[PDB]
Design a protein around this ligand. Structure first.
Ligand SMILES: [Zn+2]
Length: 255
């Protein structure tokens, strides 16, 4: 198989006698295929930055092992060269400490796997607008990726209602550095949707939210280039192309 860096793929496996799916010593969780009782699914994601050239997964069964090889593709992302090199910034301590603390909190959430579906059918887009900055736009130094856009930006004047892309449980609902006023929703199976730069947050941590329910108003909080909605998806432990993920997910789970 082949997979572009920064995208997710739904792996299909036989359910009968399946025991576990491993990359190296890391276990990959599985869930039911909604349409074929004899199959299960797993989400495999490649990181955008510094992905391996090739991946070998192993599905262990009661009396056989199945090897799955995935070649990494560079894709056709937009990219521009940086001419500074030292993307090493020097924030003051108070900002450094806040960034570190919010990173620890987020990583605990994104690795807290919910082994059931909290979603309800297909994902919807969180507002009926258009993309102004696509996922995966990169800045490179000597053909090494220094940074990239980890979600997709929708056009939105300040105060535009933002709706949950699918049902789930709110895990983050506060102002964070970089992300500004942020909402993050657990949809189950390690799938998280992200809504950044809001001007108003209308949900609370722990709230059960339904697909299409208001979660806040768009804004420009934490955003340099003016008002917009930044929409992200994390799945298989990595940020992935959100519109690509939604298309692949909906092809399987569509109502
Ligand atoms: Zn963005």
């Amino acid at each position: 198989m082949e997979l572009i860096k920064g995208q997710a793929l739904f792996l299909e496996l036989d359910k009968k006698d399946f025991l576990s799916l491993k990359n190296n010593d890391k276990n990959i969780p599985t869930f039911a295929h909604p349409k074929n009782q004899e199959k299960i699914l797993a989400i495999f994601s490649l990181p955008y930055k510094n992905p391996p050239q090739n991946t070998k997964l192993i599905a262990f069964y009661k009396d056989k092992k199945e090897e799955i090889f995935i070649k990494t593709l560079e894709g056709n992302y937009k990219s521009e060269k940086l001419q500074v090199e030292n993307k090493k910034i020097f924030p003051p301590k108070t900002i450094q400490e806040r960034i570190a603390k919010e990173l620890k909190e987020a990583n605990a959430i994104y690795s807290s796997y919910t082994p059931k579906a909290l979603f309800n059918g297909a994902f919807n887009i969180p507002l009926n607008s258009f993309i102004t900055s696509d996922f995966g736009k990169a800045r490179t130094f000597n053909e090494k990726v220094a940074s990239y856009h980890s979600g997709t930006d929708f056009r939105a004047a300040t105060g535009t209602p933002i709706y949950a892309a699918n049902s789930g449980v709110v895990k983050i609902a506060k102002d964070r550095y970089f992300a500004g006023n942020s909402v993050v929703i657990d949809h189950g199976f390690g799938i998280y949707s992200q809504y950044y730069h809001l001007s108003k947050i209308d949900v609370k941590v722990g709230q059960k939210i339904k697909k299409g329910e208001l979660i806040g108003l768009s804004g420009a909080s934490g955003r340099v280039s003016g008002p917009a909605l930044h929409f992200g998806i994390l799945a298989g432990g990595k940020q992935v192309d959100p519109l690509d993920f939604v298309s692949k997910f909906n092809a399987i789970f569509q109502l």
